[PDB]
Amino acid sequence: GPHMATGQDRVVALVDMDCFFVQVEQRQNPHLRNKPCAVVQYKSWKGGGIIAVSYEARAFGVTRSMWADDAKKLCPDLLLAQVRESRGKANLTKYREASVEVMEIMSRFAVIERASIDEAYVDLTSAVQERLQKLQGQPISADLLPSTYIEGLPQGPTVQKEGMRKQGLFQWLDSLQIDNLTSPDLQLTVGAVIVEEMRAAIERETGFQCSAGISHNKVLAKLACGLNKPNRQTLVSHGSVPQLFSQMPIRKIRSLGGKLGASVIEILGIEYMGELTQFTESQLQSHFGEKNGSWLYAMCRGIEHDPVKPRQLPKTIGCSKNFPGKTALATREQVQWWLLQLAQELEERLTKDRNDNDRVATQLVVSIRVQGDKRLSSLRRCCALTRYDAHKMSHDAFTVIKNCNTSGIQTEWSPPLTMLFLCATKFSAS
DNA sequence: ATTATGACGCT
DNA sequence: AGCGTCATA
Ligand SMILES: [Mn+2]
Ligand SMILES: [Mn+2]
Ligand SMILES: [Mn+2]
């Protein structure tokens, strides 16, 4: 009873940009605003590959990983912005720099964990305590939560969407006990007030809209964030978890979207997150391992302890290119030319990183894929990264992969390379 | 012929 | 270390 950990110790948010690369291009080019629009990479092959889609375009059924030629069949007036190409390859610098804009604003409110190019977790526990003390037991007005959904509400004894949101929010605020500074529901609510402020700052200062989730841990915050995209935020309380999870496919939870999630479904013969509660911790550990089993046992009850790491910067800087079909690299000079291209982009990004962030990478990882291999990577080798010099790095990368060439004579490369990848790792302060 | 990333876990 | 898994625009 009094000793059941309920995982309500923290307030955690996840802020995720809406259709992020599209918004970056729409800010740059006002003609793309409020239009069905997508961002594409390359063009020659089937119109290019779509990697981001505006919500207007999603209404036509356009998705990521769709060829633009096919997207145009669903949406003839679809507008397209192309990813920059430099040194023969897609270059994502504009989006990385836009990401930094957003991450630096979020960092003014709390220490953040950069989780992708367009999202970060925030531990708001401390900030909530201070806002609460400042609050002096004054109720939280609905006006402080103008874009917030309370998951699970309204419920019990209007056909418009904004009307429903307000009803739910009213029920939530009506039930709150603002008298108790240690009340988790209150703490989440104040967390949501801060995230409204955060999201307003991001939009004011960048032009970019985002969504967010507020809960007691990262997995619930991430899940919450997606519930009312775009341009809205969602509070998932501890109490909302049983109903929420009772019809939530297991694959929707972060980390369960792949083989593990499929094995949970197959081995246990269940479909929804909530169904996990009927297994003992030892039962889950027996099937999925000690760590996974303990994680599942707590997660299906709404509990997770994974901390928000204080890391705002990526800990690796990498450059990669596929060489699909018959563009696969079959000669030495080809392989060497592309290693140089990759190395030159890597040097440029590394040098900028050193100046901005007072650190130096010390290890170079070289990865290739060979024709026939289903795996993402066929081979990964490391060597020392001692100088930010593209020609040295590309020469070194070649040295480490030299022996993968099975051809008798050295001018040819066989079997042809379908992927090159250079990654700088192991940063030290400088 | 989705591609270009990036983090974390296992052994 | 090198490989595998999972994730995101
Ligand atoms: Mn996003
Ligand atoms: Mn995201
Ligand atoms: Mn996405």
A19 touches strand C (CB under 7 A): yes
Is position A119 annotated in a ligand binding site? yes
For residue A421, say whether its CB is under 7 Å from any atom of strand C.
Answer: no
Answer for the pair A106, A122: CB distance below 8 angstroms, yes or no.
Answer: yes
Contacts of A125 (CB under 8 A, 6+ apart): A9, A10, A11, A12, A187
Token pair of A167 as six digits:
């009803």
Cα–Cα nearest to A97, from A276, A295, A314, A298? A314
- Nucleotide closest in space to A49 (CA vs C1'): B2
| Chain B nucleotides reached by a protein CB under 7 Å | 1-10
Confirm whether residue A64 is marked as ligand binding. Answer: yes
- The CATH H-level (homologous superfamily) assignment of domain A1-18+89-249 is Reverse transcriptase/Diguanylate cyclase domain (3.30.70.270)
Measured between alpha carbons, how far is A272 from A245 in angstroms, rounded to an integer? 7
Considering the four listed CATH numbers 3.40.50.720, 1.20.1740.10, 3.30.1490.100, 3.30.70.1140, the one that applies to the domain covering A308-430 is 3.30.1490.100
d(CA A29, CA A83): 14
Outline where A18-124 has alpha helix (H): 20-28, 55-58, 68-74, 93-106
CA-to-CA dists, residue A41 to A25, A61, A65, A90, A411, angstroms: 13, 19, 10, 7, 32
Q: Name the nt closest to A44 by C-alpha to C1'.
A: B1
Q: What's the CA gap between A50 and A70, in Å, rounded? A: 10
Nucleotides of C under 7 A from a protein CB: 1-9
Q: Which CATH class is domain A19-88?
A: alpha beta
3-class state of residue A120 by DSSP:
strand
Which nucleotide lies closest to A64 by the C1' atom and the CA atom?
B2
Q: How far apart are CA A373 and CA A93, in angstroms?
A: 30
Q: Kindly determine whether the C-beta of residue A119 is less than 7 Å away from any atom of nucleic acid strand C.
A: yes
> Coil, strand or helix: which one is A10?
coil
Q: Cα angle at A16 between A36 and A96, to 5 degrees? A: 80
Residue type at A91 in one-letter notation: N
* Residue among A353, A334, A356 at smallest CA distance from A423: A353
Resolution rounded to one decimal, in angstroms: 1.6
Exp. method: X-ray
- C1' of B1 to CA of A128 (Å): 49
Residue showing tokens 């027996």: A286
Angle CA A40–A224–A298, to nearest 5: 120
Q: Binding residue per annotation — A4? A: no
Rounded Cα gap, residues A288 and A264, in angstroms: 8
Residue A324: CB less than 7 A from any atom in strand B: yes
Q: After which residues is chain A broken (C to N over 2.5 A)?
A: 157
At A428, is the secondary structure helix, strand, or coil?
A: strand
Amino acid at the residue A351: T
Assess whether A289 (CB) lies less than 7 A from strand B: yes
Distances (CA, A) of A52 to A17, A62, A80, A113, A245: 12, 9, 10, 23, 29
DSSP, collapsed to helix, strand or coil, labels residue A299 as helix
Chain A window 183-242: residues with CB closer than 7 Å to nucleic chain B are: none
Instruction: Characterise A173 by phi-psi region: left (phi > 0), alpha (psi -120 to 50), beta (else).
Output: alpha
Reading the block at residue A290, the tokens are 């000690």
Distance, in Å, from the CA atom of A389 to the CA atom of A382, rounded to the nearest integer, reads 16
As a rounded value in angstroms, the CA-to-C1' distance for A6 and C6 is 27
A257 Cβ within 7 A of any nucleic strand C atom: yes
Those residues whose C-beta lies under 8 Å from the C-beta of residue A141, and which sit 6 or more positions away, are A173
Structural domain spans, chain A: 1-18+89-249, 19-88, 250-307, 308-430
Question: Using CA of residue A384, residue A322, residue A101, residue A29, what is the dihedral sign?
Answer: positive
CB atoms within 10 A of CB A417: 25
Distance A271 CA to C9 C1' (A): 29
Q: What is the DSSP string of A195-256?
A: HHHHHHHHHHHHS--EEEEEESSHHHHHHHHHHT-SS-EEE--STTHHHHHHT-BGGGSTT-
Are A44 and A324 spatial neighbours (Cβ–Cβ below 8 Å)?
A: no
Ligand 1 centroid to Cα of residue A24, in Å, is: 12
CA angle (A319 as vertex; A207, A335 as ends), nearest 5: 145
A228, HSE (Cβ side, Cα atoms, 13 Å) = 21
Q: Quick check: helix, strand or coil at residue A191?
A: helix
Residue A199 structure tokens: 């999201």
Ligand nearest the Cα atom of residue A64: 3
Spatial CA neighbour of A96 closest among A284, A342, A348, A340: A348
Tokens (6 digits) for A236: 């998932």
What is the C-alpha separation between A402 and A101, in angstroms, rounded? 41
Angstrom distance (rounded) from CA A122 to CA A112: 5
What does CATH list as the number for A250-307? Answer: 1.10.150.20
Task: List strand residue ranges (DSSP E) for A252-315, in order.
Answer: none
Tokens of A272: 């929804």
DSSP state of A83: P
CA distance A132 to A405: 64
b/e map of A245-267 (b: 16 or more CB within 10 Å)? Answer: beebebeebbebeeebbeebbee
Q: Residue A257 in 3-state DSSP?
A: coil
Distinct helix (H) and strand (E) counts, chain A: 14, 16
Token reading at A400: 């480490």
- Cα distance from N-terminal residue to C-terminal residue, chain A: 52
Q: Which two tokens stand for residue A188?
A: 């989440």
Query: Locate tokens 């997508």: which residue?
Result: A38
Q: Could you say which DSSP state residue A26 is in? A: H
Question: Residues, chain A, total?
Answer: 430
Q: Is the CB of A97 under 7 A from strand B?
A: no
